[PDB]
Amino acid sequence: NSLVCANCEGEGCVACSQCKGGGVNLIDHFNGQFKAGALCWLCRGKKEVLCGDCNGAGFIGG
Ligand SMILES: [Zn+2]
Ligand SMILES: [Zn+2]
Ligand SMILES: [Zn+2]
């Protein structure tokens, strides 16, 4: 059976973990290519992504 996802609490989407919901990179990255203050490499300014644990379902199966 399904359980509501403990990581997002059912939201499915979550705040982007890279920019923390601000939309821009917070650091110059170790790769040398993502710059602090540029558009977030992961969410491209949308400020959210899908939850990694449930892939956006909000629930986990049995
Ligand atoms: Zn989730
Ligand atoms: Zn959301
Ligand atoms: Zn982001």
Swiss-Prot record:
It is found in: Plastid, Chloroplast stroma. It comes from the Eukaryota. Zn(2+) 2 binds at C16, C19, C40, C43. A zinc finger (CR-type) spans 1-62. Zn(2+) 3 binds at E11, C13, E48. Zn(2+) 1 binds at C5, C8, C51, C54. Interacts with the RuBisCo large subunit (RbcL) assembled as an intermediate complex made of eight RbcL and eight BSD2 subunits. Chloroplast chaperone required for RuBisCo biogenesis and translational regulation of the RuBisCo large subunit (RbcL). Stabilizes an end-state assembly intermediate of eight RbcL subunits until the small subunits (RBCSs) become available to produce a complete stable RuBisCo complex containing eight small and eight large subunits. Belongs to the BSD2 chaperone family. This is Protein BUNDLE SHEATH DEFECTIVE 2, chloroplastic. It comes from Arabidopsis thaliana. The gene is BSD2.
